[model samples]
Target: ASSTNLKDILADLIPKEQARIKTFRQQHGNTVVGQITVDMMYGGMRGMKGLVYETSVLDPDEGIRFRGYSIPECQKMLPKAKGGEEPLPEGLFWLLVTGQIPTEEQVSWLSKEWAKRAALPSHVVTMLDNFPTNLHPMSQLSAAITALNSESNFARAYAEGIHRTKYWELIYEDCMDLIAKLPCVAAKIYRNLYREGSSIGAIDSKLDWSHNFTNMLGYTDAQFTELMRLYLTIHSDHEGGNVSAHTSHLVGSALSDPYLSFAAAMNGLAGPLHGLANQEVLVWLTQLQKEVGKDVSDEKLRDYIWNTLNSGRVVPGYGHAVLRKTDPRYTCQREFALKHLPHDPMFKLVAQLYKIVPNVLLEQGKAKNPWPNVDAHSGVLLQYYGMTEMNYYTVLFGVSRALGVLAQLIWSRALGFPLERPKSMSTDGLIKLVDSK
Candidate 1:
């Protein structure tokens, strides 16, 4: 089938029952704050028990098979151009929603479709240029997107009394526009921050999604495409539990403008323990290396990682609240290292740390799953590619994550869910409820 037809068919496949639940939640549970606890922190909440989103697989230990294909399996079975790697994001995205891997022709068709959506307005560039460079890139990003709210077709259509049935289509267009423009905005931030005020040019039709991003960010197209693909794909979704995805869903439930809803989600992504955890991982690792001096040994590295945990610091990527085994994203990354930079000392350190750190954390009974997540190896992999600016890692995460969050936003709006406004209990009321329990 044609890619456009496939996408439409997938859209139609949205289960009526799930749609009903979504509407029910939007109408009734938007403001009801269930208990918030360290469970989200420790992966024990169980609130999402029966919920069905996609589950990620960990390889060897646990594998993330979207609809039953492991990451590597997806790569192998999904359509890839003759000489390309196995795990293509275009193919994975098709599999994620439709339960089928697209053909090489189908994947190419989708990429072309996405490419057609890739133009950002010159005015958007002017707005980004006007922002202070010293502001956090995420701050600049949020501001830039919010500024684009003036052009939001969904909001404009709604204001024009567009019928409720058309709301989903309107928001979907907004999502495509935003997704198309994100790399432009993100690349501009990089250029402004590091390139003497010169921004990289817009989308290159010849490159794939990751390659285009690499080209825009001033990186040469020298074998970094795989890392970029893995980076973009693996971080795409996390079962919708994290702040960014959750916030996007919550705000979109209120029927906020897509741009506004996305800004709200980005703010959540900026939090320390959520998407920002990627940046924290790099910073912590760099600091550890610096503290242990130039000749840091494996033992020293292990000791420092443990001490960080011992002192009540959450090892940035060591444990997950939902994953009980090493994250499949981590394994995918590890496989990338094995293929590309296996001999590098830094990669060796990561591998060694993975083996020992989990055992120690398990023995200490502190880390719930004692597994390395996507954050654990991302920095080192980027560092190997000479993108060692740890502070900017999360921005990359934000760029990739925009795909999934925006997709979910389209789903939420299409389901015609009303604005989300969950109820909250005051501390005293919570105390009384807890006493009763």
Candidate 2:
């Protein structure tokens, strides 16, 4: 396969004229409002300030263009199994990261290939089994990955003085290995949390990407396969500015092993304002419904959502740091709801919120992009499907995100980026800098 250039990949995915518009925006300034720092700190004397990257956004009317493909375009062109819709957002992940649409044959190839690599190494599983059930699954995940770092070939190979160019291949292998194993670890947590007592078996080669997830969780129902696919795809990547992706790239820059870098990235993803925001949205909505006690008219719900904003809490998922209108991913999820559960009260509440929240946020001038993010309506769909475990939602996110972050790790090593060694500053130092300013 030919190595894909970034521009060509976008052109293949996005319409030519839309791609031209994106190019124009990129060359001009797309104001990044998320990275305003009131203070700057520096240490280690290398002039690195640990600045956070702003989240990427499209204009209020347009949406994310993976490479250059819009979210809808990806849904159409990516591979899907027979009797299934086009590749779901989850399935579109491979296409977005690799810049090639896998055939159903190719997706099947990955399913089989990954199954062979899914085992957790006996010690790894034993270590997880030792954790108390009360432990946060994120903690278990982070610790398990950290423990597996002891087995990292790239770290060992680099220590033994391997050639520089060969380092990336080792990182790539470890990334693939870890991506293949994450669902195994994630599914284990589900069984443990639900008190299922025993673990589900590993991936089966015959299943599609989402089916494999269901199979790992021992879920036999087919209704959730499409849901799982959409969930995974939409949450996979959001440009490279998200905290998890940026952290992973920053850590990998220091020539860290893939395991360590990915673990660091997951820590970033665990924050409430980032990947975990999806769970927060669900919990907040549940609380509102409980308070309203079934008298929740659409108008009442809209007013309540505005009150949330007035109280200075982010309206859960209503506004983004980057997107100024309804996220296309949100639109896709809404489309899914329209097809599957149009009459669901919770879904209705969410739809009403999406309709009213953006305009309110814009009027208040607190939101950079007064648009519903992917998180806005996600919980409604999951709740409607009877999967209301808000706490566990981000674990599903992590499994899908592993694909993109790991791909980035491979690229970091391939480009020969140096070890990541960012700097920090003391308050006194920051004060001095501010005084100078």
Candidate 3:
């Protein structure tokens, strides 16, 4: 146990977890008595527990708990670099999957394994080259990942009639390969979309996953390197119920290759209600600045927020579906800004809104969660560095989310989770249920 490959470690872990779940379900499968009302079904099955996700869970008041550890706890417990303030995303991945902290040695080895797997297949590169530049970077991202499906271990094994019990092994291989290759695929999408003729670099063997990712994106600053690590860790997963996470699990239920499933998830993340919200927040804030001439007082900003709400469009990042308090993800970024760039104008605006918006939400009954989410400040950090292409922000999110989602996909097979189909009701069927209720 002193030093072992992550796959080997998880190989031992899965059976233990599987046995635990099996006995628990056997003992308690009939214990549930909660009723699902019509509203629950209509509201995207909001409170229904139709799936089991072992990775992370959400607490409405407390935010996300990755393996029972909150973001603040993870920051302190997970392995970090020599003097780094935040945990490396590599360690966070280990925690999410295994429910235990990785030793620095284990994290380093995992980082190296990911690096060794990061190279793109040349045909994937050629496929990327063929997409029109006018295509959305997200579309390009999905396409590139699907193109990588040609190399999937699960795909090959399934073709040869591999035993069903052996699916987890190849699923694990495919997941590691997919997670390792995402940075290259995403960075290539960025370079192709935003940097016309400029080439991104190959991964540096010595750098951690985050550092290599920043390198692939054509960034060189050490600060950006640290920022990328924190960003990737925090944005990786926010519990399995989120649109992107659910979509990945849902698609993978059919035993799709990791590339196909994750690529499907990226398309969901491109939606406005999901991973696109950060870019939306950035747009709203920048528009306010442009409309009010960039140096507006807090009062003026407040007025703009009111006007947006009064005009039937609520503030982009202020409310959440489940969280009741200010998002911890938002708070961490705010702290980072306060420590690093307190005087920067954009950050000052975000900070000012952080103080004002919640009170305004309380004043008007329209706001749902009154607190800003991860989207509230994510784009500012990217913009604080020079990554100004707002539309491509979710592409970065898609890359980070691959780690969490793929880990769960591997576990899904290892656990022999069933095909995920909930009973669908037609409009009349739902109306009858509503009437009965």
Candidate 4:
């Protein structure tokens, strides 16, 4: 029901969206949709609606909806691997880019297309291998991406003075190339640090994107392959205001190539407050496991929660910046754990925390959203599959996140979104303005 090629479909679709946006601006360009609060400005722009991100929206109560489809809806509707229950990330990429569900044939075409472009240049490979073991995987990841800009089609075309209107087409090519090569780059880091410099081998053109990634990481378990499919699809995007998405969009606005823009995004993702939360969650859980053992009672867990809060630290995974309800990404991973590793002690500990943490958070009267986010369950699932290196968790997150940010990057260029500059107010200026009022 759709074109087998993404570029062809985007060629037809971009002009329609461009015209629609032009008309939208003509009709309502002066409308004031959201009021900016003083708190919002100072508080990392939390709850601020400043962007026109097309790929997904996170509802306070309903969690993330990608292209107006909930995670469960995507699970049922998006193309899955043969005999697989989870959605292949390629379908999510297709949906994010085109705003339509793709056919299996379309998804198959994307898988092969990515596989074809998946090779890393020799210099990038050399750089990754030469990185010291003490360097963070996320650091290596971002550095490798930055170095890959030498291969950027957008930068080369822009240097020759290509028409501005044609920028998105070339940016789309770089996005595809960068996304395809990211797995190879990431798997190389994984092997060098964690696997004692083993070979990552080749990308099998017949395999889907997630399968190839799992293979490169030296996993042969079918269940872990399925888990990778699910993990990559769900973590692919959240919304535009998040650090990684916003960073990428901001850099790309200055006409940075996808590799450079995405490298900047990955650096933001490496922050402790953003994509690093999953690794934090696992660390906290490990400490708890050591203290209370796996089979602690609810009363004891409640006291531990109180002690953590009383000691002046936030529970790592029990709250989100936006979602007031439990994240659907969390629920889906919980479901996967139930299906595959129900009896595992760590999964049970996580399940127990799911039961107890929300109520404890509610009684504490601090958190705006007292529920587990996607980070709560992700590391447990990864650990169950034997990927125990906690620092590398954010790199997996960066890989999945590329799908969403890069999709929005293509849209940003197509819609001609300009450089994102916001007015700044100093605290003294705010005080003087309030005094005058």
| TM-score per candidate | 0.84, 0.81, 0.94, 0.95
Q: What's the lDDT for all of these models? A: 0.72, 0.70, 0.84, 0.91
For model 1, residues 316-337, the per-residue Cα lDDT tens digits are 6787655678877788888879
Q: List the residue pairs that clash in candidate 2.
A: 10-68, 13-69, 89-233, 90-233, 253-418, 253-420, 254-419, 254-420, 255-419
Kindly give the number of clashing pairs for every candidate: 18, 9, 0, 0
Pairs with steric clashes in candidate 3: none
| Tens-digit lDDT string for candidate 2 (278-347) | 7777888788779775657767766776787788777777666545567888888988888888898788
CA lDDT, candidate 4, residue 232: 94
Q: lDDT of candidate 3 vs native?
A: 0.84
Give the number of the best model, judged by lDDT.
4
Q: Scored by Cα lDDT, where does model 4 land? A: 0.91
Alpha carbon deviation, residue 217, candidate 1 (Å): 1.1
Provide the lDDT at 424 for model 4: 95
Candidate 2 — which residues are off by over 4 angstroms?
1-61, 86-93, 293-295, 303-314, 362-368, 422-437
Greater-lDDT candidate between 2 and 3: 3
